[PDB]
Design a protein around this ligand. Structure first.
Ligand SMILES: Nc1ncnc2c1ncn2[C@H]1C[C@H](O)[C@@H](COP(=O)(O)OP(=O)(O)OP(=O)(O)O)O1
Ligand SMILES: Nc1ncnc2c1ncn2[C@H]1C[C@H](O)[C@@H](COP(=O)(O)OP(=O)(O)OP(=O)(O)O)O1
Ligand SMILES: Nc1ncnc2c1ncn2[C@H]1C[C@H](O)[C@@H](COP(=O)(O)OP(=O)(O)OP(=O)(O)O)O1
Ligand SMILES: Nc1ncnc2c1ncn2[C@H]1C[C@H](O)[C@@H](COP(=O)(O)OP(=O)(O)OP(=O)(O)O)O1
Lengths: 673, 673
């Protein structure tokens, strides 16, 4: 029943040594725990050969790509990994890896993989034939310069994507098909979310008899019950609906029998017409999209509301409903101050930067609230009858370290290896239930790249998070990685000799995304910011001009390359801080079980004490200015989590919303307290 | 606000005239209501031609089969119907027909069809080309000798079956497919019920990881939520399951959050192994059907429990669960005394008479608890992958009058016309969502025929319902209609030159159903019973021998011909009593709205006062003896509703269950109080 030594060492960290903390007690809490637990619970082997034979015979890996190398090359990459002798600085480093991310035994009572082993296997999977590229993947990974996504780093050749975005058409067979597809993907752990802007409203005529539609809320109840059969999902709605108030009745603070959501996150996508109508404080008009489909031929989200609003107003066919949009703004701010629900997307601001607007307009995002692509709704008829194959969205993940890239300065080769690995993931992944997402991943070849450790690295350098220096740092750095990513995508579309589909209507084929970058040089205007960027060439606008000429020469390979997700589940094993969102506490405190670990921030001392600020005590306006500074280079959206408190008010949240709509911010996340 | 005259006349019926009731006040309550309401709210026409033109142009009928006759032939059958000048004797006769069963206007504020019109249109639909057969259908219908089923008589050529029985396989794609099919048929108003004997138990391994099955109760919760999207359904389970106690937790008298059923009726199908194990008062063993499928290869209901019970006992592979079956009998009787739930089916007793036992064994029935056929479960893979087409059950309805057939004595031609009409219904009906029931209706060509007015007719003749005279009457009469139905089916399979599928393995191809009837002449042993049957030839065993030779000569057309449903919704417009279940009250009293109609039984006077007994004051044992006497001629089951009271006990209900299992009773219905 006795607490072991390393847990007591972690308890000893919080002992006030002259007003500070016993940080080095972590290390023994590392070092004893390696000795007393890790090295005493590992399965013994006599060599590498019998170890690999045990891995083969005990049915733990796909043996094919493992047999794409010799045993000597496998031992070479293993010796290369073990030549690091990686010394974990954090208790949570080993305390999450060998606890969760490491592949253990079948009874899960001993250790199988080491920290080098999983990384080397993932490197062999990413390289898939080459030994030296796998060693480069190791050097990108064993120095923690890159970290792949959670199922990607988890089940590389074992027994894959957490981003899925679909639509729904207005037929019962479509409803059953979508229910089936969500149940198919729910057992695979992928993040599946949708949007319901193409369904008929409550109390409408179902094709023969008047006043027959039970409403969308029954379908939401059905999907909420359907998600109770697996381990989660989400759905959206365009704002100009009569049941949009009922869309606010979903996440009601009085949890009803008739409305009881537990899994489906909601998010209201607001075009500029609604903030236009609420800004003038004039009464607005939502409509019936089935009457719109019966009158004009298309759904309401098929057309822009700013054009066709008065065209719906004067036309007597589509039935009206008149409300106050300012009262809806008040109730939205009220629900956001209650919880932080729902999400808000400025889809016109998304299309204001969207390169593939020639295909469609983005009208929704994921649960991770980051991916913004084009889409097409399908249509499913009966079983004997033939159906349709629309367009879908699937964007893989995987982050890098700002700190390790900025210290090791292999940034272009980092872009090379990360792009090749994400290309390999997009190639290998296949879906055999809904062929629409299969066709979408086959057609778009879309990837998503992000990064972490912004506040911890820059605050570790002695730079405030609320500095314009850090904003210019993000500006120049993401200009450089934008240069390298577009350079790599154009090189890859050259080397393949082939680009993604509908590349010609995008801004890359016309060079319009580079039109911002052929002028307006984002060279660092601050001295410490430039000195951090010293040691490497900063690409100017002429480099962007040659990049534009090379893109117009061949083409670009990925319709999207970048997304930013809250990838906080891997910061501990990356021995690093979170993503570009600033930290909340200098010391995380957890009760693991029968214990209290006290994990401080990595690099926490008294010099960066006030550089490691608190998220409850920051100006959010400088944060969204930084968000816009980063969004100057990101194609898709960024999951900006709002860091708020309980004492704030709804009208200041409204001012934040007007400020973000003024900044052209794409999406927002659930708020803090 | 004043109560109209005919309602006051109906109130005047209950006035005690020398200890009796003012029956003839019904007639003025008929006759004034015809004058003051019916003839004042009908749409005027100048002739028949403009009336039919209005029916065509106002989109009320399928015009094709109406154009399969001349206007003169239509006027001939209309003149034939109007030559009856049918005088309604009951207030509820017109009060349900022109209120509900008649096709009214689009705003439903006037009358379109007359009582002759709907009947004549239905007759033209049944004949479909012939005028004289339609007039014969009129004479069968306008004299109330036959009444078709509710959607059949309702929507004959307008804008169809209430019996659907399916199965479920053990895959998620199968689950989604069945959910889709139930949602497809729910909008069409058909009675859809299933059985869940081929699903894995709660807390079992889902194919890779141990203890992962949430259980069948979540699927039941899902189907209960899914039926909230339309206007009802049911599901069963074989008794030898570990979750069979949880099957009793469904209709729990404490309505839970976690278990809240509102639509799904349950019914436990009990083979002779369970009453064997509960009879000896020995501890029984339910099993895990997924372990059974993994061990022997088949589900548990694939094999007989009486054989394979000890083979499951000695085999250590299938995991056991040991209970007391007598305690389950006690809790079953407790729930039946609480409500009347669930249903009880002796499937071995069903197979003891089942002619198509060469196909499979009957393991379930419908919500109407009457139809017992063979079945095969399907299997549905993914969307791109190929699926299976199993067997299903769909049995049409439609009843006749014992009184009118016994008075008009056209019993063989009644069988002819009813069989041809039910054949036409089975031919015209098609399903375009689940092709399995389409294939099943195409393959079986199965019909269902029943009758009504047993207690009212025989009690109107001066015969007690609890007489063995009435039992011999039902014996001889249903022997005669069995003779005529088998004769008609054999004649029809001769005239088509073609029988139903798998006819050769049935008892009809081997003559074994006639082996009971080539001996044991069911001639009437009572004098008044025979005198009611006098005036027509009673078929002896030699007629059954020639029938057997004619069946072996060609074949029989329908795998099933007979079923008995509680068709009480049409007795009022048939001016008749209920089905073979005896009446409960001599005078039905209803509060229609702002009123109190008092509809007595048809033919209620002081002579048949004690012949019109009360169902709370009868011996149920004579009733189930009558049930077995009728079941001596019926192929399928009969929905015997239990007529019980509150003062009775559970052990007497157990004695009733043992008595019915002793009688070979197929199924039972929900009980009374
Ligand atoms: N931070 C850590 N990261 C990885 N392994 C560790 C860490 N801390 C302790 N250990 C491991 C390595 C050894 O197997 C054991 C402790 O021995 P350790 O002294 O840390 O390594 P070492 O063998 O390279 O140095 P030395 O020769 O001085 O013993 O547990
Ligand atoms: N009985 C019902 N109860 C509730 N919703 C229904 C019912 N029947 C159909 N629906 C729902 C589901 C469908 O998405 C929507 C439209 O009805 P449905 O007949 O299936 O579409 P449709 O493709 O035939 O054309 P339309 O859009 O004109 O109705 O209404
Ligand atoms: N029981 C009923 N069945 C059908 N129609 C009825 C009934 N009772 C009254 N009516 C109808 C028929 C007439 O249109 C009107 C009442 O006239 P009614 O006397 O019953 O018929 P009738 O016209 O054949 O006889 P009469 O020539 O003596 O008036 O309402
Ligand atoms: N994640 C899940 N949660 C709950 N039930 C599931 C889940 N995944 C599958 N199932 C259910 C539905 C299926 O009817 C049943 C069997 O699982 P499933 O993998 O779909 O069948 P299977 O055809 O692949 O073979 P098997 O019967 O061996 O499992 O368990």
């Amino acid at each position: 029943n006795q607490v072991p030594k390393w847990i007591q060492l972690n308890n000893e960290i919080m002992i006030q040594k002259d007003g500070k903390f016993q940080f080095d007690k972590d290390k023994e809490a590392v070092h004893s725990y390696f000795v007393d637990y890790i090295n005493q619970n590992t399965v013994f082997f006599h060599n590498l050969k019998e170890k690999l034979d045990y891995l083969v015979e005990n049915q733990y890996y796909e043996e094919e790509f493992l047999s794409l190398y010799s045993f000597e090359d496998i031992k070479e990459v293993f010796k290369t990994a073990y030549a690091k002798k990686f010394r974990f600085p954090s208790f949570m480093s080993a305390f999450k890896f060998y606890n969760d991310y490491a592949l253990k035994t079948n009874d899960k009572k001993k250790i199988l993989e080491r920290y080098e082993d999983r990384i080397s296997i993932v490197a062999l999977f990413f390289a898939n034939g080459d030994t030296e590229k796998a060693k480069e993947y190791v050097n990108l990974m064993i120095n923690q310069e890159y970290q792949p996504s959670t199922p990607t780093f988890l089940n590389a050749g074992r027994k894959l994507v957490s981003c899925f975005l679909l639509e729904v058409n207005d037929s019962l067979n479509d409803i059953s098909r979508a229910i089936d597809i969500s149940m198919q993907l729910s057992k695979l752990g992928g993040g599946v979310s949708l949007n319901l802007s193409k369904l008929r409203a409550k109390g409408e005529a179902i094709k023969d008899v008047e006043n027959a539609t039970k409403g969308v809320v029954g379908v939401m109840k059905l999907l909420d019950n359907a998600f109770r059969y697996a381990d989660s999902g989400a759905a959206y709605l365009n704002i100009f609906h009569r049941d949009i108030n009922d869309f606010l009745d979903t996440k009601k603070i009085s949890a009803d029998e008739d409305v009881r959501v537990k899994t489906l996150s909601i998010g209201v996508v607001i075009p500029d017409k609604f903030v236009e109508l609420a800004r003038e404080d004039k009464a607005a008009y939502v409509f019936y999209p089935h009457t719109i489909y019966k009158e004009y031929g298309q759904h309401m989200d098929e057309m822009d509301m700013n054009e066709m609003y008065d065209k719906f107003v004067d036309n007597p066919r589509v039935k009206k409903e008149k409300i106050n949009p300012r009262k809806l703004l008040e109730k939205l701010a009220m629900l956001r101050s209650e919880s932080g629900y729902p999400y808000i997307m400025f889809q016109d601001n998304v299309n204001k930067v969207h390169a593939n607007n020639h295909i469609s307009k983005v009208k929704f995002s994921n649960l991770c609230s980051e991916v913004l692509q084009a889409s097409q709704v399908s249509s499913y008829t009966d079983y004997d009858e033939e159906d349709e194959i629309g367009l879908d969205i699937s964007c893989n993940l995987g982050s890098l370290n700002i700190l390790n890239v900025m210290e090791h300065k292999s940034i272009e080769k980092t872009v090379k290896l990360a792009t090749d690995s994400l290309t390999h993931v997009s190639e290998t992944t296949d879906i055999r239930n809904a062929p629409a997402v299969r066709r979408a991943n086959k057609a778009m070849k879309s990837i998503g790249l992000g990064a972490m450790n912004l506040h911890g690295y820059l605050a570790q350098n002695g730079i405030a998070y609320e500095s314009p220096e850090a904003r210019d740092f993000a500006n120049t750095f993401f200009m450089m990685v934008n240069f390298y990513s577009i350079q790599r995508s154009a090189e890859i579309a050259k080397e393949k000799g082939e680009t993604f589909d509908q590349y010609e209507g995008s801004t890359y084929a016309t060079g319009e995304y580079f039109d911002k970058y052929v002028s307006t040089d984002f060279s660092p205007k601050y001295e410490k910011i430039a000195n951090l960027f010293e040691g490497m060439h900063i690409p100017t606008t002429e480099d962007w001009k040659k990049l534009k000429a090379f893109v117009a020469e061949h083409g670009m390979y990925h319709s999207y390359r970048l997304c930013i997700a809250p990838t906080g589940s891997i910061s501990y094993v990356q021995s690093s801080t979170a993503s570009v969102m600033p930290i909340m506490e200098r010391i995380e405190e957890r009760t693991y079980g029968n214990s209290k670990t006290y994990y401080p921030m990595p690099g926490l001392a008294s010099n960066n004490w006030f550089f490691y600020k608190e998220a409850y005590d920051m100006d959010m306006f400088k944060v969204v200015d930084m968000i816009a500074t980063i969004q100057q280079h990101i194609d898709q959206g960024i999951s900006f989590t709002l860091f708020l408190k309980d004492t704030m008010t709804t009208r200041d949240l409204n001012r934040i919303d007007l400020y973000a709509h003024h900044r052209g911010i794409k999406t927002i996340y659930y708020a803090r307290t």
